[PDB]
Amino acid sequence: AQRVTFRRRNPYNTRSNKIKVVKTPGGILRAQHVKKLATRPKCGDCGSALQGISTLRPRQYATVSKTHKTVSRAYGGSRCANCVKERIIRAFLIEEQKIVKKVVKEQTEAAK
């Protein structure tokens, strides 16, 4: 039955003007402005959410330690484990194929 008001001078229901109702130690209801929820960081190769990375607004990442923003692996953070594995496999196999093709081309030049 207790009705509430905006605590700021914006009277419209915009994306930055969202409120929730909270009961205070004074025994009354009051509005409380809620910030926009954070979005999980995404992988650079597949676009999926990154496991083990904290979910914060972009300015808030400057306030936390390096543990909350990385994982202990190559490309930890920016890329996910499956994509890192796939690019490792691709790198090794393509380098081996390049060596094979160079040897084959040298043999073909010699025989031709």
- Residues between 3 and 62 with contacts to RNA, criterion CB under 7 A: 3-6, 8-13, 15, 18-27, 29, 32, 34, 36-44, 47-59, 61-62
Q: How far is the CB of 90 from RNA (least distance, A)?
A: 15
Radius of gyration of the chain (CA): 27
What phi-psi label fits residue 75: left (phi over 0), alpha (psi between -120 and 50 degrees) or beta? Answer: left
Closest of 31, 33, 3 to residue 17, by C-alpha: 33
Residue 10 burial (CB count, 10 A):
11
Contacted entry of RNA, Zn ion, none for residue 77, CB cut-off 5 to 8 Å set by kind: RNA
Binding of residue 110 to RNA (CB under 7 A)? no
DSSP code for 77: T
Task: Determine if 83 is a binding residue for RNA (CB under 7 A).
Answer: no
Footprint on this chain of RNA (rule: CB under 7 A): 1-6, 8-13, 15, 18-27, 29, 32, 34, 36-44, 47-59, 61-62, 64-82
